[PDB]
Amino acid sequence: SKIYEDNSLTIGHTPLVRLNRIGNGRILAKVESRNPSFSVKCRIGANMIWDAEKRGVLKPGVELVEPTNGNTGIALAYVAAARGYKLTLTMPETMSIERRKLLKALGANLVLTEGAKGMKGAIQKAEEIVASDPQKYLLLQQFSNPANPEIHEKTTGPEIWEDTDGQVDVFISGVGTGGTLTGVTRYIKGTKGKTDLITVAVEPTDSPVIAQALAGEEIKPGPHKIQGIGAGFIPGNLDLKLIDKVVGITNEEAISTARRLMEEEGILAGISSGAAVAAALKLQEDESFTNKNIVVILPSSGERYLSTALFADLF
Amino acid sequence: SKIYEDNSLTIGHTPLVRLNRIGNGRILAKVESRNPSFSVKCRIGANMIWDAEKRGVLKPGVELVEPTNGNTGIALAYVAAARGYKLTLTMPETMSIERRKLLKALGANLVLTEGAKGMKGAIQKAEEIVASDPQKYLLLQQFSNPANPEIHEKTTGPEIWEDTDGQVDVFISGVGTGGTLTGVTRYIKGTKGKTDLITVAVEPTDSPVIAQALAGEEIKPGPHKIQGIGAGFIPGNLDLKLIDKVVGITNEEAISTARRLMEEEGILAGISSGAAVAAALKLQEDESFTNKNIVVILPSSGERYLSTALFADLF
Numbered sequence: 165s166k167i168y169e170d171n172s173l174t175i176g177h178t179p180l181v182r183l184n185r186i187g188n189g190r191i192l193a194k195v196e197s198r199n200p201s202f203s204v205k206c207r208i209g210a211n212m213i214w215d216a217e218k219r220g221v222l223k224p225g226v227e228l229v230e231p232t233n234g235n236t237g238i239a240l241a242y243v244a245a246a247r248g249y250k251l252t253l254t255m256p257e258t259m260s261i262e263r264r265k266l267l268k269a270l271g272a273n274l275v276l277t278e279g280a281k282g283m284k285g286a287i288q289k290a291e292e293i294v295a296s297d298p299q300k301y302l303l304l305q306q307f308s309n310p311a312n313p314e315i316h317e318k319t320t321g322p323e324i325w326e327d328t329d330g331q332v333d334v335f336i337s338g339v340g341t342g343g344t345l346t347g348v349t350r351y352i353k354g355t356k357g358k359t360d361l362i363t364v365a366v367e368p369t370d371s372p373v374i375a376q377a378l379a380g381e382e383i384k385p386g387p388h389k390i391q392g393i394g395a396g397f398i399p400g401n402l403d404l405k406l407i408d409k410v411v412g413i414t415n416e417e418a419i420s421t422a423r424r425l426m427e428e429e430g431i432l433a434g435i436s437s438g439a440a441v442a443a444a445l446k447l448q449e450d451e452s453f454t455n456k457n458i459v460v461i462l463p464s465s466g467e468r469y470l471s472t473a474l475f476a477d478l479f
Numbered sequence: 480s481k482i483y484e485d486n487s488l489t490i491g492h493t494p495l496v497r498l499n500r501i502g503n504g505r506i507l508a509k510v511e512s513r514n515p516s517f518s519v520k521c522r523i524g525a526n527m528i529w530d531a532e533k534r535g536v537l538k539p540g541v542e543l544v545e546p547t548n549g550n551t552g553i554a555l556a557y558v559a560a561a562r563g564y565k566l567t568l569t570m571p572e573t574m575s576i577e578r579r580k581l582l583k584a585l586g587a588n589l590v591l592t593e594g595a596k597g598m599k600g601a602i603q604k605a606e607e608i609v610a611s612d613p614q615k616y617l618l619l620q621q622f623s624n625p626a627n628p629e630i631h632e633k634t635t636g637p638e639i640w641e642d643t644d645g646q647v648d649v650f651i652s653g654v655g656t657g658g659t660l661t662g663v664t665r666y667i668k669g670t671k672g673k674t675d676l677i678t679v680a681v682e683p684t685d686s687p688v689i690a691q692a693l694a695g696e697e698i699k700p701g702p703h704k705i706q707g708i709g710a711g712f713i714p715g716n717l718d719l720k721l722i723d724k725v726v727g728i729t730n731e732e733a734i735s736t737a738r739r740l741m742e743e744e745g746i747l748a749g750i751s752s753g754a755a756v757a758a759a760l761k762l763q764e765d766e767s768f769t770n771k772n773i774v775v776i777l778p779s780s781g782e783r784y785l786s787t788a789l790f791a792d793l794f
């Protein structure tokens with residue numbers, strides 16, 4: 165039989181679909197919205213909590229706290245509800261009412277911080293709360309907790325190797341916390357020894373922090389609209405030495421390519437999914453990439469961004 | 480290798496999750512939102528189109544038309560985009576702008592009909608269009624097309640039998656087109672010969688059309704808020720003789736139970752998912768159901784209904 169004890173155990177095994185109209189027919193898309201709370205974060209939500217239980221730092225009585233309202237907040241919320249923990253999320257008071265209803269329905273406690281203070285303010289409040297009683301509260305820290313890239317090394321990477329029978333030549337991943345790129349690459353180049361794999365990091369042209377860092381230049385971030393990637397600094401969970409190439413993508417390229425995924429392939433896709441695919445299209449303009457099999461990660465579904473520019477001016 | 484030719488081929492194999500706080504620990508929930516366009520309809524969207532191709536009535540040049548804007552419209556739209564067909568959907572002009580943006584992004588052509596005329600008006604327009612050129616247009620008809628219950632007999636039913644090792648005693652399904660209930664029951668009672676399986680149909684107390692029909696009373700439908708079920712008539716795809724029991728559920732019971740699924744189990748759920756589970760709770764008040772394994776279908780995710788009463792008054 166195959167009966168899951170709780171929803172956090174259903175993560176992974178997402179499909180690899182060939183794109184037929186976008187590109188030359190060799191781009192293979194991994195659909196991470198096929199997860200329990202519908203995004204690639206479902207995997208780390210589950211693993212960061214399972215990891216804390218195994219280390220003995222998470223048990224009944226200990227509450228969770230994290231400064232985030234994006235896909236990671238949604239993922240932590242369904243896992244905490246599924247396994248019986250209380251969760252507090254801090255975020256700017258400017259946050260969509262849509263997002264807040266969803267998080268609240270999953271039972272999360274929402275602590276809204278000063279709009280003018282942005283993310284730094286949310287992060288601030290989260291630390292005050294945990295300092296208030298360090299035995300009662302546990303902060304997970306998605307950008308540096310090793311349990312994040314660990315789940316990708318244990319599930320995402322193996323799924324990709326298996327589904328392509330090891331025929332993957334290029335791996336493309338837009339970077340947010342960096343866990344996906346780091347974990348999958350460690351498994352393929354490290355564990356399976358395919359050192360000739362080309363790992364491509366994708367980021368906003370408007371906040372090319374990874375390209376800067378790799379060239380030894382100063383880190384100068386900027387605002388952009390590709391939700392989910394380009395945090396503006398180099399995350400502890402991003403292993404810079406595993407990267408072979410970085411590709412910068414514009415807001416317009418990301419949005420228009422996300423739209424082609426929905427209209428031409430029938431795959432609901434968010435803005436960052438368009439950015440990763442637009443990167444594959446650029447590489448295919450170079451003849452050395454002509455006959456290579458390219459695997460790209462599609463992080464989330466367009467349905468979660470119905471209020472953004474992704475859907476603006478359709479009629 | 481396991482590389483899908485297009486997204487319509489990724490349907491099914493949804494997880495069976497045990498509910499731990501709702502009920503006595505024997506309710507097993509099948510999560511149908513783990514599908515390519517996130518609902519149980521993804522399966523019939525794919526099969527009704529594959530079936531038309533096999534019968535030779537659907538080929539390049541023939542366009543599809545269907546009067547619907549719900550999960551079936553979203554399902555037909557991703558399959559048509561994935562396999563290269565043009566699709567026209569007719570619906571009342573009163574339809575949410577949210578729903579229209581989503582359908583449009585998937586490339587569907589939207590024909591809006593008179594608000595005052597409701598669904599009947601949409602159905603009307605669809606027939607005019609097809610009559611305008613019957614060689615160019617193809618109407619699928621979800622309520623009576625046998626390809627709808629056929630996919631459930633071929634995938635959903637076998638998945639349930641396999642995942643429980645044949646230990647399922649009660650099967651609960653809210654009825655919309657009736658295909659899920661009919662197909663799964665045909666497989667279990669028919670093909671596997673488990674004739675003492677108890678099949679339970681669920682419907683709105685405010686439009687108990689199935690209970691009426693079974694008692695030989697007049698069919699008197701009424702309005703209700705449990706989106707996705709209770710169409711107000713007996714669908715050609717519902718086989719009344721396969722039903723052992725009918726349970727009526729109120730709008731309030733459906734909504735509050737859908738909320739418990741999210742908060743207590745971490746499973747994003749729509750209103751009709753709450754209705755099906757509330758039915759299991761009622762049967763468990765009867766001692767003859769105390770030690771039986773109950774499988775319930777959860778049709779869609781709560782994220783698709785963020786604008787409804789499901790999320791009203793959370794703060």
Ligand SMILES: *Cc1c(COP(=O)(O)O)cnc(C)c1O
Nearest residue numbers: 235340341342343344392436463
């Ligand atoms: C998390 C996320 C990413 C980035 O993935 P990481 O493994 O954090 O680098 C991309 N897009 C979206 C929508 C995300 O939520």
Ligand SMILES: *Cc1c(COP(=O)(O)O)cnc(C)c1O
Nearest residue numbers: 550655656657658659707751778
């Ligand atoms: C289609 C649907 C149902 C009913 O399932 P059928 O197999 O058509 O009887 C229930 N809930 C939702 C949300 C649906 O879309």
